[model samples]
Target: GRIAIPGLAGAGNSVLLVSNLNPERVTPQSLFILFGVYGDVQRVKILFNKKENALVQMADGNQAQLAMSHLNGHKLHGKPIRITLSKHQNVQLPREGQEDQGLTKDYGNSPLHRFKKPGSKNFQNIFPPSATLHLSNIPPSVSEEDLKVLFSSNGGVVKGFKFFQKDRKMALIQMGSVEEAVQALIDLHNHDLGENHHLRVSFSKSTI
Candidate 1:
């Protein structure tokens, strides 16, 4: 069980709806790492339906807005994470099994597209130090969720993340901080992503 971030107090915009998620791949810790990157996360609750979804609360309205713009439709773990502003201010604990299982963890931080399939964006990083990272040589058949799981285990706070294939394979990731981005870059460049390819990682100057 986690308490809300004090910064969220008096925030006009606090909540967001994230749909099209791979529930199995998403965990409260993952949300913390990801959303916490955008701003202080007050609360996060997974929905109680069959479709993969959840609601997230940020400490500040402007932070929430920035998160919305950076994360909407971007891939996380390879699957696109769809986001929209919610009418509700915060997520609540559902009645036991009334529908969904809540992911339990301490609060923290944390996208996609395809050539048209599930895929992965930007505006969070720059070369010197940034939150956004560039990825290449991804497995064409890999699920976005799988790709994310790979990074989750190795990369530091994945705040805003996304990936996909172009003529060549590619993706973008937002680290929790400039430090995290640099660490991931040092650790994961030119690693393997699939049968015929290995991972190629770098920093980009733009967030988009």
Candidate 2:
């Protein structure tokens, strides 16, 4: 009776229990960024006792399903993660004086929500994880070189980079490979670029 469907079975739950995560490599912020690819991640809590597991609270059941479908078997920091619906309806923040090493984070009012606005085009553009990533909400002060250098970290290489001709705030960056792109997305998705514009990174269908 242990059979459980992936995204289809979790149509009513907004929280996901993710396991098999790389304990040393995973963190609340990284999980937020990685899961934020599919939806607005409201909160993330890596278990203080069991570091290999975590709970992710998403914006809605639909978003949780979307995120689970896309990332269930994806590799992060050299391990494939397993995701399923959590029985808990919400991920509670640590209580007063509860020491969890800052493992829990509440992003309920985070400005980095891409689909916060109704009728957002972001929903229609969702694509499979790709080496080419779309970047947006960039500040005007940040130039091409700045972004290229920023992404070229943790052994990531900017294979190709392009700025949308009509909108400097948007761009596409192709990493050395899918793995590099995945790591880059986790590391810099919501990077602050000043002017109160948080970088939005997502997998793009287009190639440069």
In order, candidate lDDTs are 0.57, 0.73
Give lDDT tens digits, candidate 2, residues 85-144: 775767666664433467677777567765667765357766766788788876557787
lDDT per residue, candidate 1, 86-197, as tens digits?
Answer: 7585555556554344553334331111111122223243134356777765555775576566567774688876754345356777778655665565456545554536
Please give each candidate's TM-score.
0.45, 0.83
Model 2's TM-score against the true structure? 0.83
In model 2, the Cα lDDT at residue 173 comes to: 89
Error of 1 at 154 (Å): 3.5
Best by the lDDT measure: 2
